[PDB]
Structures are given as C-alpha cells and as structure tokens.
Structure 1
C-alpha cells in the first residue's frame, strides 16, 4: 500500500500504474482479510513480472 504515491519506484508503480508527480487527490485503503483471503491461498488477481 505504501507503493501508491507519486514519484515512487517499485514492483507496482514501475509496471502496474504510475501516479504522476503533479497528482492531486487522495488514496484510501482498508482491511479485507475476511473477504478477499481464503484458506489455502487466492490466485484470482495477477500482476506483472
């Protein structure tokens, strides 16, 4: 979640989507363990390598 900020560099901002340096707005995140996590491991969401 730390990776979502303007000007950063990492496995998401480099290849998934980049926030512009002049970006204005807000970022919101919250807990979804009970819904998006299942016993055994969820492979539903991909990312780039």
Structure 2
C-alpha cells in the first residue's frame, strides 16, 4: 500500500494508533505483521506555490 502523508503522521501508521488520518483515512489491524517503509519527498512532492 502506497500513499503520501504529512511528516508528523509517520508515527500514526502502527497497530492500535489513534489520529485523524489513523481513524478516518487509513487503519491498521491490531495483529498487523510486516514492515513499514517511509522516506521524505521534498525533491518530488514539494512546490514553492
């Protein structure tokens, strides 16, 4: 699963986590198994305007 979120919300992607994106956008099962990969994208997903 791939998407783009804010910097402060990288912690919210985890089992048993609460937040605006955690509750209303994306929810992980409490028994989740796997790995999480995230990297900054200012060079690609940032615009001066």
Please classify the TM superposition score into its range, dividing by the shorter chain length.
0.7 to 0.9
What's the counterpart of residue 20 of structure 1?
A: 29
- Larger RCO (alpha carbons 8 Å, 6+ apart): 1
Shift of 1:31: 1.3
Task: Report the number of matched residues.
Answer: 40
Gaps of 5+ in 1: 41-49
Aligned equivalent of 1:33: 42
Q: Give 4+ residue runs of structure 1 displaced > 4 Å after superposition.
A: none
- Aligned mates of 1:17, 1:35 — CA distance in 2: 23
Deviations 1:11-46 (A, max 9, x none): 111000110000000110001101100111xxxxxx
Q: Report the 3-state secondary structure (helix = DSSP H, G, I; strand = E; otherwise coil) of the residue aligned with 2:43.
A: helix
Superposed CA RMSD in Å reads: 0.6
